[PDB]
RNA sequence: UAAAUUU
RNA sequence: AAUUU
């Protein structure tokens, strides 16, 4: 029946001017050569994104869906949740959050300026007194960096972000925040993926894998999941929120926000014109993440039941899931995934790329990452998390007047410290750069480079400094991504690392600790590394 | 724009 | 601040 969007025809305009690369990239031109492949998505491409996300939805539910939906509500009723004092909600606003149309921004909100507090009270009044008038939203194209990919189109068109004014964002938090903190875990138990750390997510996947007699795994993602959300899904989302114990005042707000904001509304471009109308998920709302995850979980568990997946063990993070189950032979397994995918499609959550059963944990990707294995110091298998380095390397080379990528290097160094690509490429380059700038003591996004060894031990285990014998997949992929971006091959990084290492040792202090721990892989005479006080 | 995780 | 979705 219903259509995800409708368009006035007005353009999707830019928040401000969009930054462009320069003829020299001083920080990254030693990292990689092919800067022509590094691009940032712009509003210029917004029109194309709109076409791909505008389409007719038809949903057909069934006993399996209904049964799951029932069970989820008997779980939701164990949750009691409170309102948030207008003030408490203001304090959860992020520092640089986009300012309101009504002459105040986040400085004012977080500091509880009177004008801001007053407007907000007024907006929350209106939610209580009017449960129908659509709330207007702004639509913008997100600016994100990527490496080109001819196999999949050349250059991706920009994601569309749709969000209400700042006043409404706070009110949302008042009504819903406590719920967002309690509901998912109460509904999905151990299947709620955002609860876990990267290490726990690995322990969990392995425990699941291990406890089957004959494991079969797969992953599923939905194509433009936000468009696939039906008006009805969003209302079913409401009724799940209401299953909790709630202040009467919340209920009225939840319902008002549902009917006015969440199921749809008009859209205005940054220059002010009417741009279109919306009958699906808005990316910009508080319930976007919770809602996606619950809704995906409902459909997925229903589909599991439609398709006969035996003994499923799930993991859901938004529209991304992994099911680990007992194989029924490859013949039946292939049949059931086909079924799973039909069921999901009938529920209006069709796949980007249809899924496939797999029988090796390394071959299951989800959230653009996967589990792999290498050998540890004493020769035991050590399982860990990694990904295609293509994007991180591309983002590593995004240098603009306004933007430096050094923060991104560090972010990826920490998150992925056991990965061969971090250890040989990013680390070498990061430390090489700061040594020459002579800025190791300096703080990057409130982290001290010289704390890395400690930081990494806390997070990844001392094994992170001594791992070796990486998988064929991981070696092939790293090699292939450095070749793709015109970076030196690993052998060259081996050389650079030795040099960096020696230089770091020269300086003594914490610098030499970094030199010895982070770069021990690079030497012939590997020094025995023990735990670190810090 | 929203959230989660990491610091 | 980073990353993910
Ligand atoms: C907008 C989304 F709902 C998106 O559809 C959903 C699934 O992620 P993905 O599978 O990567 O993207 P599509 O399925 O939409 O192609 O997660 C939310 C999402 C992703 N990114 C952002 C963001 N930057 N802000 C807010 N929400 N959001
Ligand atoms: Cl070991
Ligand atoms: Mn998706
Ligand atoms: Mn209601
Ligand atoms: Mn996804």
By 3-state DSSP, what share of chain A in percent is helix, strand and coil, each rounded to 5? 50, 15, 35
Are both A326 and A470 inside the same structural domain?
no
Distances (CA, A) of A411 to A382, A399, A428, A511: 22, 16, 14, 19
Are both A360 and A384 inside the same structural domain?
no
What number does the ligand 1 atom closest to the CA of A223 have?
A: 14
Judging by DSSP bridges, how do beta strands A137-141 and A265-268 pair with one another? parallel
Are both A344 and A381 inside the same structural domain?
no
Structure token digits, residue A374: 């290498």
CB A340 within 8 A of CB A304: yes
Distances (CA, A) of A400 to A143, A277, A396: 13, 35, 12
Domain boundary among the residues A368, A389, A418 is at A368
- The domain total for chain A is 2
Domain boundary among the residues A317, A336, A368 is at A368
Are both A170 and A230 inside the same structural domain?
yes
Q: How far apart (Å, rounded) are the C-alpha atoms in residues A176 and A96?
A: 22
Nearest to A522, CA basis, from A503, A485, A496, A488: A496
Structure token digits, residue A113: 């300026």
Are both A343 and A469 inside the same structural domain?
no
Distances (CA, A) of A509 to A127, A440, A441, A504: 59, 12, 11, 9
Residues with a beta carbon under 5 angstroms from ion ligand 5:
A 221, 319-320
DSSP A447-479: --GGGHHHHHHHHH-GGGGT-B---HHHHHHHH
Judging by DSSP bridges, how do beta strands A38-40 and A381-386 pair with one another? unpaired
Q: How far apart (Å, rounded) are the C-alpha atoms in residues A303 and A346?
A: 9
Are both A340 and A445 inside the same structural domain?
no
Q: How far apart (Å, rounded) are the C-alpha atoms in residues A275 and A11?
A: 7
Structure token digits, residue A152: 């999949």
CB A357 within 8 A of CB A218: yes
Structure token digits, residue A195: 């609860």
- Furthest CA-CA distance within chain A: 74
Instruction: Report the interhelical angle of A166-188 vs A63-76 (nearest 10°).
Output: 100
Q: How far apart (Å, rounded) are the C-alpha atoms in residues A172 and A34?
A: 44
Q: How far apart (Å, rounded) are the C-alpha atoms in residues A417 and A266?
A: 45
Q: Is A361 exposed, middle or buried (0-12, 13-18, 19+ CB in 10 A)?
A: buried
Distances (CA, A) of A438 to A192, A247, A396, A500, A505: 44, 57, 20, 13, 15
Are both A298 and A381 inside the same structural domain?
no
**Ligand 1 surroundings by CB, under 6 angstroms:** A 142, 221-222, 224-226, 281, 283, 288, 292, 318-319
- Give the CA count within 13 Å in the CB-facing half-sphere of A369: 16
Distance A446 CA to B6 C1' (A): 12
Nearest to A398, CA basis, from A154, A39, A156: A39
Place of tokens 């990239």: A25
End-to-end CA distance of chain A: 60
Q: What is the resolution of this structure in A?
A: 2.9
Instruction: Report the interhelical angle of A166-188 vs A231-242 (nearest 10°).
Output: 70
What number does the ligand 1 atom closest to the CA of A226 have?
A: 5
The helices-and-strands tally (H runs, E runs) of chain A is: 20, 12
Distances (CA, A) of A439 to A2, A88, A204, A450, A452: 57, 39, 40, 10, 14
Are both A326 and A411 inside the same structural domain?
no
Are both A132 and A166 inside the same structural domain?
yes
Task: Give the nearest nucleotide to A415, CA to C1'.
Answer: B6
**Protein CB footprint (7 Å) on chain C nucleotides:** 1-5
Q: Is A11 exposed, middle or buried (0-12, 13-18, 19+ CB in 10 A)?
A: middle
Are both A298 and A427 inside the same structural domain?
no
Structure token digits, residue A160: 């569309």
3-class SS at A268? strand
- Mutate which of A139, A283, A317, A320 for ligand 1? The one with the most ligand atoms within 8 Å of its CB, which is A283
3-class SS at A109? helix
Are both A100 and A222 inside the same structural domain?
yes
Q: Which residues of A288-299 are buried (b: 16+ CB within 10 A; e: fewer)?
A: bebbbbbbbbbb
Q: In whole angstroms, what separates CA A471 from the centre of its chain?
A: 25
Q: Which residue is nearest to nucleotide C1 (CA to C1')?
A: A445
Place of tokens 């992925």: A416
Give the determination technique.
X-ray
Domain that holds residue A398: 369-534
Are both A335 and A477 inside the same structural domain?
no
3-class SS at A384? strand
Q: How far apart (Å, rounded) are the C-alpha atoms in residues A492 and A509?
A: 27
């Amino acid at each position: 029946s219903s259509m995800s969007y409708s368009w006035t025809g007005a353009l999707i305009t830019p928040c401000g001017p969009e930054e462009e690369k320069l003829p020299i990239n001083p920080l990254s031109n030693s990292l990689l050569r092919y800067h022509n492949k590094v691009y940032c998505t712009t509003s210029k491409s917004a029109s194309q994104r709109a076409k791909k996300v505008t389409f007719d939805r038809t949903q057909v539910l069934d006993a399996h869906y209904d049964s799951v939906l029932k069970d989820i509500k008997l779980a939701a009723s164990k949750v009691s949740a409170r309102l948030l004092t207008l003030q408490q909600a203001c304090q959860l606003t992020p520092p640089h959050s986009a300012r309101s149309k009504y002459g105040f921004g986040a400085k004012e909100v977080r500091s509880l300026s009177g004008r801001a507090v007053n407007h907000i009270k007024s907006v929350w009044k209106d939610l209580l007194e009017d449960p129908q008038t659509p709330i207007p939203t702004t639509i913008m194209a997100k600016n994100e960096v990527f490496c080109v990919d001819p196999a999949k189109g050349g250059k991706k068109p920009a994601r569309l972000i749709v969000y209400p004014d700042l006043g409404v964002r706070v009110c949302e938090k008042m009504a819903l925040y406590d719920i967002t903190q309690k509901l998912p875990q109460a509904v999905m138990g151990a299947s709620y993926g955002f609860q876990y750390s990267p290490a726990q997510r690995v322990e969990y996947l392995l425990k699941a894998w291990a406890e089957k007699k004959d494991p079969m795994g797969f992953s599923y993602d939905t194509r433009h999941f936000d468009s696939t959300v039906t008006e009805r899904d969003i209302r079913t989302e409401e009724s799940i929120y209401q299953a909790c114990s709630l202040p009467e005042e919340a209920r009225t707000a939840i319902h008002s926000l549902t009917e006015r904001l969440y199921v749809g509304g008009p859209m205005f471009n940054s220059k002010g014109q009417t741009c279109g109308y919306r009958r699906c998920r808005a990316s910009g709302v508080l319930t976007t993440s919770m809602g996606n995850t619950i809704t995906c979980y409902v459909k997925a568990l229903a589909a599991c039941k439609a398709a006969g997946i035996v003994a499923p063990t799930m993991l859901v993070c938004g529209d991304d899931l992994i099911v680990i189950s007992e194989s029924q032979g490859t013949e039946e397994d292939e049949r059931n995934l086909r079924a799973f995918t039909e069921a999901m499609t009938r529920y209006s959550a069709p796949p980007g790329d249809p899924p496939r059963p797999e029988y090796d944990l390394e071959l299951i990707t989800s959230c653009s990452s996967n589990v792999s294995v290498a050998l540890g110091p004493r020769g035991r298998r050590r399982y860990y998390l990694t990904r295609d380095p293509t994007t991180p390397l591309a983002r590593a080379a995004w240098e603009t007047v306004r933007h430096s990528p050094i923060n991104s290097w560090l972010g990826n160094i920490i998150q992925y410290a056991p990965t061969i690509w971090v250890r040989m490429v990013l680390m070498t380059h990061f430390f090489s750069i700061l040594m020459v700038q002579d800025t190791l003591d300096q703080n990057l996004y409130g982290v001290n480079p010289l704390d890395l060894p400690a930081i990494i031990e806390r997070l990844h285990g001392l094994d992170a400094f001594s791992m070796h014998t990486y998988s064929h997949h991981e070696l092939t992929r790293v090699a292939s991504a450095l070749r793709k971006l015109g970076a030196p091959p690993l052998r060259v990084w081996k050389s650079r690392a030795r040099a960096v290492r020696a230089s770091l040792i020269s300086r003594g202090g914490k610098a030499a600790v970094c030199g010895r721990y982070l770069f021990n892989w690079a030497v012939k005479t590997k020094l025995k590394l023990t735990p670190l006080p810090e």
